[PDB]
């Protein structure tokens, strides 16, 4: 592995834009909720996951 | 593996734009919910997943 | 592993912009909730996850 | 002219709403211009006009 | 002219609302310009006008 | 002219609201300009005008 002249981007997340306005969100009767917005993950070498969003619920009433 | 002159992008996520306005969201009676927005993941070498969004629920009433 | 002349970005998260205005959020009757905004994670070598957002709930009424 | 019990509205202008957003206006090469927005005029007894918007121009080039 | 019990509104201008956001205006090469916004005029008895917006121009180039 | 019990509003201008945000205005090459905002005028008895916005210009170049 060698690089004489290079520009190597390996596992990069850039130039991510996000605009949100006058939005609205309501979660009313939820067992388990997960509400996220922007979620940027970068990694060169992995063994597990990169982004996990898990939810387990129960609503009896 | 060698690079004399190069521009190598390996596992890159760039120039991601997102605009949202006057939106509306409602989750009312949910066991388990997962609401996400932008989710940018980049990785060169992986062994597991890249993005997991799991939900397991139950609604009795 | 060697680099004579290079610009190597390995596991980088940059230039992440986010604008939010006049938004609204309501979580009313939730067992377990997780509300996030921007979540930037970068890492070269991993063994576990990169970002975990888990929620487990229960709503009896 | 008499009023025992009354609610007389004589020459009234009420409940005027106006919303403008992300608009755009350009007047570039104009002799005489008149740009107005909301213009509410009320009057019981008149002898002249109620609202005058006059413009007289000339463009030679 | 007499009023025993009354609520007489004679030449009234009320409850005028106006919202403007992220607007834009440009007048570039104008002889005479008149740019107005909200203009509320009320008067019971008149002999002339109520609101005059006049403009007289000339553009030679 | 007489009033036993009354609430007479004669030439009134009330409850005028105005909201402006992130607006922009540019007048660049103008002979005579008149830029106004809110202009509330009330008067019971008049002989002339109520609001005059006049502009007379000239642009040679």
Three-state SS sequence of A19-38:
EEECCCEEEEEEEEEEECCC
Query: How would you classify the pairing of strands B2-6 and A2-6?
Result: parallel
Encode C23-45: b = buried (16+ Cβ within 10 Å), e = exposed: eeeebeebbbbbbbebbbbbbee
Which residues of chain B does C57 touch, with a Cβ-Cβ cutoff of 8 Å?
32
Find out whether A11 and B42 touch, Cβ atoms under 8 Å.
yes
Q: Is C30 on the interface with B (CB under 8 A)?
A: no
Closest alpha carbon to E22 in F36, D26, D19, F38: D19
3-state secondary structure of E61: coil
Which residues of chain F does D32 touch, with a Cβ-Cβ cutoff of 8 Å?
55-57
If you ran DSSP here, which 8-state letter would residue C59 be given?
B
Distance (Å) from the alpha carbon of B2 to chain C's nearest alpha carbon: 10
**In whole angstroms, what is the distance from residue A44 CA to residue B9 CA?**
12
**B and E adjacent (3 or more CB pairs under 8 angstroms):** no
Q: Do D3 and E1 touch (CB under 8 A)?
A: no
Closest alpha carbon to E40 in F39, F47, B10, A44: F39
**In whole angstroms, what is the distance from residue B56 CA to residue B33 CA?**
8
B14 has binding-site annotation: yes
Q: In what order do the strands lie in the sheet with A9-16?
A: B9-16, A9-16, C9-16
- Counting one residue from D and one from F, how many pairs have CB atoms under 8 Å apart? 4
Strands (E), C1-61: 2-6, 9-16, 19-21, 25-35, 41-45, 52-56
**In whole angstroms, what is the distance from residue B53 CA to residue B49 CA?**
11
Resolution (A): 3.4
Q: In what order do the strands lie in the sheet with C19-21?
A: B19-21, A19-21, C19-21
Q: Tell me, rounded to whole angstroms, the distance of Cα B36 from its chain centroid.
A: 8
Q: Give residues with Cβ within 8 angstroms of B32, minimum separation 6.
A: A30, A31, A32, A33, A55, A56, A57, B55, B56, B57, C55, C56, C57
**Partner-chain residue, chosen from F9, F38, F51, that has the shortest CB–CB distance to E37:** F38
Q: Which residue is closest to C22 within chain A, CA to CA? A: A22
**C and F adjacent (3 or more CB pairs under 8 angstroms):** no
If you ran DSSP here, which 8-state letter would residue F47 be given?
S
**In whole angstroms, what is the distance from residue A46 CA to residue A42 CA?**
10
What would the two tokens of residue F54 be?
């006049």
Other C-beta atoms lying within 10 Å of the C-beta of residue A61: 10
3-state secondary structure of F43: strand
Which residues of chain B does A36 touch, with a Cβ-Cβ cutoff of 8 Å?
35-37, 39
In this complex, which chains have at least 3 CB pairs below 8 Å with chain A? Answer: B, C
Closest alpha carbon to E33 in F35, F23, D60: F35
Find out whether F53 and D34 touch, Cβ atoms under 8 Å.
no
Instruction: Please give the backbone phi and psi of residue D28, each rounded to the nearest 5 degrees, phi first.
Output: -100, -60
**In whole angstroms, what is the distance from residue D28 CA to residue E27 CA?**
6
What would the two tokens of residue D60 be?
């030679």
In this complex, which chains have at least 3 CB pairs below 8 Å with chain E? Answer: D, F
Distance (Å) from the alpha carbon of A54 to chain B's nearest alpha carbon: 5
Find out whether F36 and E36 touch, Cβ atoms under 8 Å.
yes
What would the two tokens of residue F12 be?
């009134």
3-state secondary structure of E16: strand
Name the β-bridge partners of F32: E32
Q: Tell me, rounded to whole angstroms, the distance of Cα D61 from its chain centroid.
A: 33
Binding residue positions of E for Cu cation? 14
- Counting one residue from E and one from F, how many pairs have CB atoms under 8 Å apart? 256
Closest alpha carbon to F9 in F51, F50, F44, F47: F44
Choose the mutation target among B5, B9, B35, B43 for the interface with C, i.e. most C CBs under 10 Å: B43
Closest alpha carbon to B41 in D37, A52, E54: A52
Q: Do C61 and A58 touch (CB under 8 A)?
A: no
If you ran DSSP here, which 8-state letter would residue F14 be given?
E
Q: Do B55 and A58 touch (CB under 8 A)?
A: no
Q: How does DSSP assign B10-58, residue by residue?
A: EEEEEEE--EEES--EEEEEEEEEEE-----EEEEE-SS-S-EEEEE--
**In whole angstroms, what is the distance from residue E40 CA to residue D36 CA?**
12
């Amino acid at each position: 592995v060698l690089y004489v002249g290079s520009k190597t981007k390996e596992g990069v997340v850039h130039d991510v834009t996000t605009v949100a306005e006058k939005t609205k969100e309501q979660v009313t009767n939820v067992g388990g909720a997960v509400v996220t917005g922007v979620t940027a993950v970068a990694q060169k070498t992995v063994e597990g996951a990169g982004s996990i969003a898990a939810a387990t619920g129960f609503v009896k009433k």
